[PDB]
Symmetry: D2
């Protein structure tokens, strides 16, 4: 007999695992517990803070939801109106000295007239071929060309996507992108060129809310707090080291054994295969591809510059900077950085020089958060990436050479993006059903490795729906039908369902 | 305070309501009851029997859901509760029994027609190569799939006889998301090879209850319910629905309070019982056909010309029925034993039998369907005789065949019609009922034919309860293509909830 | 026996008949003569002159044939017999002079219209990508080339004003074999770049006679013929054609016997002169428009707003003419020299001049065309004033401009219409004439507009003779696309036959 | 001064040169003469006769005409009704032991059913692709696949055309084929499959006439006889050895020099370049391609076998025989072979063995004429080709092993077909204008090298039109617009034109 026995064991307390725990806690039938190796729940949605008081999320995380269930849990976790700030998505692409409104491919009107010709010509070619197309594109690259033409592919989509994914567009599938990549309408794009108009409203994150305090990680701390503490085991005491799938036993770092009837595993599936000592699965998971993410944070002295304005996040296809995205993180909340009266010395100027004095001066302060991708196809010099990012900020005119930097941050996250390679689905259909036959629900950004359902709301619901499948026979819609859940308002499942209403009578 | 109070009230014990009841009974959380005005559960999936002992259903099953299978296996668990058959169907066309699907078997038609059919399908294939719109009417869908020549021979005249409306007046989304395009190579190849081939075989089968017909399933399913939570018969006839008070009043005066209502009666009747004039006007804008079911019991061994045929399609105008079923092929117990003695009522040509004496069998049995609507009236007094003449005209019966039993019943609400206007009307009705905590679901509860056969209907009830209790998506109601194109294996009659509770 | 007998008789001394005569005179084998009821050769390519000294043609030459060039160079051999100009043309649209071709220059229009035009051309380009039929009407051809928006702005309303029938009633084979499809990229590129570009330049030119207008060519060409083989004037008016006896009767009673007839008169007149009621019935089923030519002589140096413009198109309804020609740009001698004194007849707004004194020039000159048909009547008594008002409306003239000369003439047979029914009717007429050894050829001799300008017409006559004498294919008559798509260099005014004979 | 001076010199008295001569003689203006190195005019349209009395043409030459002028000249030369025999074209493709009516691609209905499926499937694919085609095919092969589908390409068109052209279909252009290769209508071909019907009437040679005596060569002897004898120079006395294009002088083998003003050269253009000692022209003509043709003749004892019947010519795509075509030459005229009373010994049996008797026996006789192609891409064993053909006749069941052969014939024609290679036009537009600038009209099957206007009537009219261009400024329509002249009735030019009618008064 093992030390602990539960019906459902949840590994991981990021959004996916916390979703599973919330649904298990709501249903309150089968016994359960949740474990994580970090004392602070949140996974890749956690928030760091520099010694100078600048918060940085793991990547430009904004909250936007396809599911009422997710909303219920965030509102339960952070119920006050001043727990949240709402913002319009202000997003731009840096191109040839200009800020081009997102989506690029729908704002060709902003480029020089000569580039407009190249872009529209390519889009005419794509539209004529699309009129007689009877096949689907097989690669991300073919999709880009078929729906945008070469001109826009060469100017933006191809170089940008290598900088994000750390693989070329030719190496990725294209089924994942229904909700991420705008395919442009020839008439709408040409009309806006003729009229000199913009169109910034495309996509599901065109409006968002951001927590007032604690960054994204504050959400998941607050969510986890609603759980019965005795059903949680966070820290080294909850680090999983062995998974014995045949005995349905998990061994923790401190030697605690947990027997389960059903396992919801949200750790990276390649880690799970190793913890299972299952060489067949290790070999299979090693056929998946992922990129690492470097997050760089730069805290700057001064009131928010006019050139920055209300910008939220920014795309950088060009090779004059290492990062693919910048976030004006100080626009998301005033509490992402110190108050104006906080006194801080200048660590360096944006041009790399040292300040003359160690004098601590007051603010106000603003803050830039940058992301750089790394993979076996795209190495990154870890020792210089911070300075290269700051120089990239000067190259893109986001910082003046004289700007005073008062705080820096750099962290590398090994599993950053699960890559939608051409091979992903073929490998996953060998991995996930084999785990399924052992009553292991491997779910999450790296639990099930599908980026298109790898956001905080999708991840949360992957855990929710996994539990719903275990307990109530529910379809795991998010796991297997991203287009289906992304194309509808998912209103049916609530934090208080009929089951709980009728039981309380 | 009302006489009875339950969390969830289910009106109707046809497949839809029994699905709702089966899921409520499985969940065993909220209180509930199910009512029906008929003492026998089954609704429009019941089975009648003539005084001579021939059964007639109002039905072939194909299940898209493990949950449905679980409930049927629970109700009828023994292997000899069922007979399995291949899905053998033919189209009657110009003196020929053409295997279904029609287009793969035009080699049986005269060569001049094969030319016209292939030429039309070539046109459709070339058009499909440059098509960039979806078809808007059932008729356009037919033509794009088949071409003019093949369309005119079968699907156009047959579907008028089925729906009692012309194909140009029906929508086509209810048929699925598949692109309307011909398989030209498959059709020409069979013409070139001079072959026929039906879409059945050892893989393509159905099973049918050994006894009691289709209605036997639903009796057996209903028997698994706690009898005290059921109220079937005149004592369970609903006469008033007060949506504002969440009260139902029965014919005997009993009032039932509910928190959520699952109504499987026809939504136009529901609107009337609600005394909701707005919904009455809206529901009267829906369209439906009535169905005449005709049953004919025949003396004799099964003729060779009938053989293993199961159901048959009739596009041509030499018979009033659109479909015939060799119902005696579904079970030996759909008709009397060979030793049962019965007199001949008439010969197939209408003449009197030579003798009035009762003679022995064996017997076989034909079930026919005729549609009726304001665009296609039916003479109730002569339709039986017209059907029998149609059996002679189609060579299903010889003039000398001995008829030993007849059956004719008219069902007022027979098919909910997928008109062009259906969805515009339903999207005004269903949300107004939903805002009153009324789940109106089923063949005429929600009026969508494509989810109105037995397995879909049952699951409409199951998923309605699952939505009420567990927040499930009602996938069958709103996404028929989605559920039909996948393996619906997740939901079971024993879910994890019940497993974990039992230990 | 008739009064005169020749192997080949030519009726008409416009370009077509003069082509026949030139080839006959070059071959110098079979006997021949040419007649015309006018004392001056040239037909509908003649030139009138107003009493005030302004020339107006009945204009611009593009030659597909070296043979035609040889004859023009023989007739007018000096370099100063001709002036060369670029082919500068514009479409008047919504207050703008839009360079031809219209669709490459819509950037001059309001942005909302550019959107409508480009959207329509996108629709047309996508339909052209899956097209598998040919257009059946001129209208369908226009829409497939241009899209709805651009069609509605120029080619649809303009061609009604030209042909006096709607575009839906005309065939479109007469335009050539080129596929009816848009150049979407070219049109969008000029919109994106905000550019204009006309289809002219240093090598897209035409030449025009220095003196005597277009009519000077045909006088000079006819002068190279042996005078005794010509019969021009009332003495050459044909009044009867007896196709069975192969006899022509002239107005003065002279009878001419022929073995082969090249008739360049209008085929409906020919059927009447033949007293062939069947052919009268068939020819009366052909359709044609009448043409009013209006000329306006203006005092002053050429205004900057006019500039180097040559001819102009008018789709809009603020003027009755479909075409205007800056005829004073074609030659300085199309109008009086600057020292010529002329009184002002009226101002462009219709008012009277302050003085009736004759004042000096210089002068410039506008030539206008208005169409007329049973589907589009024209008031003969007011059309001149309507044209002048149209010149004000289109800003070609300011209200104050001084008009010193006017000209108005109506030509009953102006354009032979490429209706849908034309070919069905012609293929019954021409073979019936051919069986009687009558080659009916020319703008109205054979009624095909696309080979009815000067070089095609001339070559219709040349090729008819070459067919009569040498068994040549009449390529221009039956294969316009063929002759228009090649350099027709083989036939020369001096062929091997004449070289070897000398 | 040269020995002779004429305005127009014609080299060659095949159909092309005789056309030039006939038009020059009709016009009767410029002085002229015609030379040929063979005493018998006719060129590649000549007729040989074996010692046993069997006539064989060069190829399966049959007369079918696009021009009234050509008809006028044939009717003048052979004016009596019994100078000619008229025949329906009975033509078949030997395919898998069966005779499939020509054209093959329109008679799919005759093949085994499994092959009909493959053929119709291929045409369906082609028809759907053709529905969205917006480019023209560039090679003969691409044309075949586009208009016929793979099944018919792989079954017939690809192997037969290699067997004829001695180059693969991928190496040929496709502008030449309008009147040679039937493009199948999908509906017509499918309809005939369904109905079990045939459609053997396609093409300009569905009917033909053949001279009663002397074979095809009898025509050209008779046409040449209408010329004034003193303006002809046929034989070794008329062999051209040097052409001095700069002096406009031709030197004959016997040393005679002829001065000309215009040259109509109908010898092979590569021979002309060699005779000109113009190395530039030699190099260009060597870039042209041609195949050689072997004509094999077999005289057979017996009344015409039932299996042969009224067949005229036959196609052999398969590898059980070396010839691509067989002609039942004895069906063209009874005077192509000896009368029945002629006594001839059996030379061999068709199986190669010696006859039982050497004694001369009577007829009747019939006669087979075979064609085998040769090129640098398709070598041929010259020494065994006669025996290989006879064995192929047995293999194809045209001869029984016991059939008695009474006469054999084999002749190789070095210049047999001018190949429509992809490079042909690019080379010709360098050759023909360069010769044109020297007043040399190089015209004919190998004079101008265009197979699509390489038949007897096209060749004749090339000579006629060259003269008409030299004298009357006529367009050389046949040379430059094969589709134009092949698609119309060329009725305008006659042997008696208006010029001559008016002159005779
Ligand atoms: O059944 C057939 C037989 C021939 N050909 C084509 O017709 C062309 C001309 O062949 P033909 O026998 O008519 O003339 P020849 O080879 O003697 O010049 C050939 O190259 C073939 O590709 C064809 O398409 N289908
Ligand atoms: O000789 C008459 C001939 O050229 C015309 O009929 C062509 O149409």
């Amino acid at each position: 007999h093992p030390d602990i026995s539960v019906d459902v064991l949840v590994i991981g307390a990021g959004p996916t695992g916390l979703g599973a725990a919330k649904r298990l806690n709501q249903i309150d039938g089968p016994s359960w517990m949740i474990v994580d190796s970090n004392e602070t729940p949140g996974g890749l949605a956690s928030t760091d803070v520099t010694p100078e008081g600048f918060l940085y999320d793991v990547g430009g995380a904004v909250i936007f939801s396809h599911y009422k269930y997710f909303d219920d849990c965030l509102d339960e976790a952070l119920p006050k109106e001043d727990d949240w700030y709402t913002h319009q998505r202000i997003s731009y692409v840096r191109c040839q000295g200009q800020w081009v409104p997102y989506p690029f491919q729908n704002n060709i009107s902003m480029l020089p007239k000569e580039e407009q010709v190249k872009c529209i010509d390519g889009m005419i070619d794509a539209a004529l071929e699309a009129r007689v197309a009877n096949t689907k594109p097989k690669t991300f690259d073919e999709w880009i060309v078929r729906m945008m033409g070469t001109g826009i592919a060469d100017l933006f989509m191809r170089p940008y996507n290598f900088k994000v994914w750390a693989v070329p567009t030719t190496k990725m599938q294209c089924a994942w992108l229904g909700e991420r990549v705008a395919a442009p309408n020839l008439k709408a794009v040409t009309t806006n060129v003729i009229l000199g108009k913009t169109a910034g409203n495309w996509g599901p994150n065109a409006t968002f809310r951001f927590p007032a305090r604690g960054g994204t990680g504050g959400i998941w701390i607050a969510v986890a707090n609603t759980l019965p503490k005795e059903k949680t085991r966070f820290g080294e005491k909850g680090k999983v080291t062995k998974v014995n799938a045949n005995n349905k036993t998990v061994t923790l770092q401190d030697g605690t054994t947990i027997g389960y009837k059903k396992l919801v595993s949200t750790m990276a599936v390649d880690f799970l295969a190793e913890a299972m000592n299952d060489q067949e699965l290790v070999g299979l998971t090693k056929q998946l591809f992922y990129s690492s993410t470097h997050v760089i944070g730069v805290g700057v002295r001064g009131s928010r510059p006019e050139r920055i304005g209300d910008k939220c996040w920014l795309y950088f296809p060009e090779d004059n900077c290492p990062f693919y995205r910048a976030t004006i993180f100080s626009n998301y909340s005033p509490y992402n950085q110190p108050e104006a009266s906080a006194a801080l010395p200048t660590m360096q100027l944006a041009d790399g020089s040292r300040p003359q004095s160690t004098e601590a001066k007051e603010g106000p302060y603003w803050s830039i958060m940058l992301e750089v991708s790394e993979s076996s196809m795209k190495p990154v010099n870890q020792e210089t990436i911070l300075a290269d990012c700051i120089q990239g900020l000067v190259n893109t005119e986001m910082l003046k050479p004289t700007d005073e930097i008062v705080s820096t941050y750099h962290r590398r996250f090994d599993h950053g993006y699960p890559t939608p390679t051409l091979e992903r689905e073929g490998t996953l259909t060998q991995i996930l059903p084999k785990l399924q036959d052992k009553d292991i629900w491997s779910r999450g950004r790296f639990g099930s490795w599908r980026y298109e359902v790898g956001n905080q709301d999708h991840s949360f619901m992957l855990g929710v729906e996994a539990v719903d499948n275990i307990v109530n026979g529910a379809v795991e819609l998010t796991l297997n039908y991203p287009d289906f859940v992304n194309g509808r308002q998912n209103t049916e499942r609530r934090l208080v369902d009929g089951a709980q209403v009728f039981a309380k009578s």
